Amino acid sequence: DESILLLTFLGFTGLVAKYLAPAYKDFADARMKKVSDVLNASRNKHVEAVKD
Amino acid sequence: LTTFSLYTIIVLLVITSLYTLTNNNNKIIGSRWLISQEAIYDTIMNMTKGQIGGKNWGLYFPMIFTLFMFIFIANLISMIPYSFALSAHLVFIISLSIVIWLGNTILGLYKHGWVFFSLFVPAGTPLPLVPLLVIIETLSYFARAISLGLRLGSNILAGHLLMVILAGLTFNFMLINLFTLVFGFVPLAMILAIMMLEFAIGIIQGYVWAILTASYLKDAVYLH
Amino acid sequence: QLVLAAKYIGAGISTIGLLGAGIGIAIVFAALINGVSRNPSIKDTVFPMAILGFALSEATGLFCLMVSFLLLFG
Amino acid sequence: MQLVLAAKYIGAGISTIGLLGAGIGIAIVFAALINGVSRNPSIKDTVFPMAILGFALSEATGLFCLMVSFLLLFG
Amino acid sequence: MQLVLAAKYIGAGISTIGLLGAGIGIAIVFAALINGVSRNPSIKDTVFPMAILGFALSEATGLFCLMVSFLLLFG
Amino acid sequence: MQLVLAAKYIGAGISTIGLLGAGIGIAIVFAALINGVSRNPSIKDTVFPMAILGFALSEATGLFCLMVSFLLLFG
Amino acid sequence: MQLVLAAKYIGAGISTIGLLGAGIGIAIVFAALINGVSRNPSIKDTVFPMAILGFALSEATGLFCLMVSFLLLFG
Amino acid sequence: QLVLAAKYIGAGISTIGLLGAGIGIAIVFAALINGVSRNPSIKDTVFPMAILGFALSEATGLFCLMVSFLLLFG
Amino acid sequence: ISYAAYLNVAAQAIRSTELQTASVLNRSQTDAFYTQYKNASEPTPITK
Amino acid sequence: MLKRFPTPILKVYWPFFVAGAAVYYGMSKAADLSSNT
Amino acid sequence: KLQFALPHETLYSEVTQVNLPAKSGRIGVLANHVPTVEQLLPGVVEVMEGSNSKKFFISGGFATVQPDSQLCVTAIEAPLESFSENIKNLLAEAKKNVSSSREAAEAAIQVEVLENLQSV
Amino acid sequence: LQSTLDNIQSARPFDELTVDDLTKIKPEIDAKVEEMVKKGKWDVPGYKDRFGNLNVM
Amino acid sequence: MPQLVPFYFMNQLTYGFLLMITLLILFSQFFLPMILRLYVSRLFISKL
């Protein structure tokens, strides 16, 4: 009986890995990119001050 | 001892892993997994600064965070098709709700004296119906006691039972001959759709717990 | 026997009254959301009144619920 | 005996039905209060006492219904 | 005996009708949210907490009704 | 037993009534969506997620009725 | 038995009541479509997919109701 | 006897379902009339929308009706 | 307060990244006066 | 990595913890009453 | 076409999409729109001609879709970028002015403009 | 200053940069974190003021 | 349901309230402040 439920669960995880998982990879990447760019920007900024 | 004890331990171990095995020794750059637990932090920062904002909100921020994560994790774990009644042991969830409700009521009485009962005077309204509005304010105030638990309990329990009964029906479509196993898959697709809805509404219900018990705490800390 | 049956049936019928409260609460909250989206800045005055309206709408439903307990337990 | 007693309980259940209308009723009054006040920012001082009157009157129908329910049960 | 058990299940069925009201109620709160946002999209962040709060409060009455159903069923 | 079994099957039919409220509820959320999109031409990016959230919640109250219905019917 | 057979023919009837809600629900989705298109004639190409979606979802709650009728009728 | 009675009873209950469809058709036509009266001009696209909407509302009623006939006749 | 006056004050506030021109400044500054009259009789030329 | 920072809000959570204890005792008594038919 | 204009200056005076902030909330016009009269409130405005989108800060005015697909927008003195930082400084001053300050209406407008700036 | 510039060039991660390196470089990190816990707040307007911040809500 | 009436209510509840106290402390003292380390570290980077 409960193996029918497990078949449903297998399908559920399949749809999740299809649609959501590449989106969530991209989402995580996007935030990471933004953080890194700000972080490195700050490094550039203090280098300018030394030169000034 | 019990099965219940074994899954409570499992919840603890999942939660440990999100602040241990998800970061790369705390890089400032951030890890893909660790970005998830940043966003959770941010939306409960911005939710509970929004709800129980005042001169404090961070003093009750851990409490609301461990209420977030517990329900957030336990409506994925309880939705594995071979996982035992934790939250679907309603007595634990409803008990947790009543504990928090009493811990608000006591907090309000202690912090705000017997003028805590001014919380159950709701507004300046015509004086001959001021006492009436105390009676049916207290009635609704300890309706807050059972509502918070009963929301979560009903949602999670009903989802698992719905799926299992329909699973049993599609079992019997496919237990008789192949022409019934044809169009035995059409209801099966409905169970898959229901499972998608049930995962969604468990995360929605998790937000609803933590906003409602922020709303109640807003009321309890800030009188009226 | 029949008396035991009767309280179970009667409890069922009394609970239907709650239907009105479920619609009722929502009409108050709907009006809150509609009002605040129309005005923007009304929300401070209106939000207390809306919670009052909610309490009263709910209160009728709690009476329905209390009749059910009065039949079933009492 | 059992049937007569039963009829009280069942009849009471049926009686409780009337209350649903009052629940919707209170909300309809309050909706208009909110809508009106959101329009003016300033109607509220005139409109609020009018609204309490409307609330009471809609509520009263509910109380009559509750009264009949009590007449069967307690009476 | 059969009568007692029958009646338990009859009373349970009957209680379930009350939930329908709450089902309409959830939709009404969300309709207001959607309408509000479309009529002023600047409101959206301020409104979002109040909206979720109102949905929950609406839902609760149906679940109280449902709790009576389980009260009958489990006893 | 014939009485208890018949009571279950009747009671199931009674429970089925509860679903109607959610059904109307779905239409109300979607109506709000259609109206809102027609207002802005462009609100849809924010609003379409709100509509899905609302739909699910209204639907859930309906499903709770169905689960009581099936509890009598199958069970 | 006779009681059980009776329960099927009656109980089926009870289930049929729920369907009225879906009928109304469908009309509401279509009403919103007409109003939407009235408000902006060029909204149609985006909106028509949304309309068929709303129709189907509202209809689905009705379907679950209609199934319970058929389960009693032919089971 | 009870089974033959139950057929006639069952049919009667089913007749109730039709009420919703009757309201439903009217609402669609009301929307047609309103849309048209506001615009003078949306009509040629909209008229098929209205007919479709009538049909679908009516169809749900028809399901109620056929169940009424099925219960009456067997 | 008249609708176009209401819009006017908003427009004046609106002449405050930045990108400023003479025509704007002139559109928001005027030295004109309005002289009320009665009868012949003249209540003063209050600044507009 | 892991670091403990003391949170002095455990004396802020005194009414919450007290409520847990009361219910803990009460559920012992409730369990005994329900385990008796 | 679209008529987007000021008194002393004149802009686009139907254009693809125009998004308007009105007493009726927000109104969108896409190609032919059924003919309306709407008062434009003080606004953040989007005009899109094709996929290209131009973003406008508008001092309110009047909007009228004509039946012949002429979206007459008339407004006083607008740009969005022009309105911007100096305005943030002004808003501080304007709060002070609101304290003291027809003067009530002026102060109400100052609050409106402050909000309108927060939208930028 | 030549040395200070060189130190930024020859000592600066930004790939394998960890909070462990910053805790090591200033005990100010732990001082502020503890002080914030004492403060009963957890909002730092810098995590959002220029660093990315998003709230799910 | 038989899965809602065990006699094990107090047993369950003991393990249940223990998990709550454990997670509360664990978050509050350990795991919440390491996210606040990310916040503070970012603010130190904001300064330089």
Author numbering:
A (entry chain U): 54 to 105
B (entry chain T): 26 to 249
C (entry chain 3), H (entry chain 9): 2 to 75
D (entry chain 4), E (entry chain 2), F (entry chain 1), G (entry chain 0): 1 to 75
I (entry chain I): 8 to 23, 27 to 49, 53 to 61
J (entry chain Y): 1 to 37
K (entry chain H): 11 to 23, 26 to 90, 92 to 97, 99 to 115, 118 to 136
L (entry chain V): 117 to 173
Task: Reproduce passages from the article.
ATP synthases use a transmembrane electrochemical proton motive force (pmf) to generate adenosine triphosphate (ATP) from adenosine diphosphate (ADP) and inorganic phosphate (Pi). ATP synthases are macromolecular machines consisting of an ATP-hydrolysis-driven F1 motor and a proton-translocation-driven FO motor. The F1 and FO motors oppose each other’s action on a shared rotor subcomplex and are held stationary relative to each other by a peripheral stalk. In Saccharomyces cerevisiae, the FO region contains subunits a, e, f, g, i/j, k, 8, part of subunit b, and the c10-ring of the rotor, while the F1 region includes a trimer of catalytic subunit αβ pairs and subunits γ, δ, and ε from the rotor.
We purified S. cerevisiae ATP synthase with the detergent n-Dodecyl-β-D-Maltopyranoside (DDM), which results in a monomeric preparation of the enzyme, and determined its structure by cryoEM. Three-dimensional (3D) classification allowed particle images to be separated into six rotor positions, corresponding to the catalytic and binding dwells for each of the three main rotational states. Further classification of the State 1catalytic conformation resulted in classes distinguished by variability in the position of the peripheral stalk and a slight rotation of the rotor relative to subunit a. These classes were designated as State 1catalytic(a) (light blue) to State 1catalytic(d) (dark blue) in order of increasing straightening of the peripheral stalk (‘no ATP’ condition). As these structures were determined in the absence of free ATP, they likely represent energetically similar conformations that can be reached by thermal fluctuation of the enzyme structure.
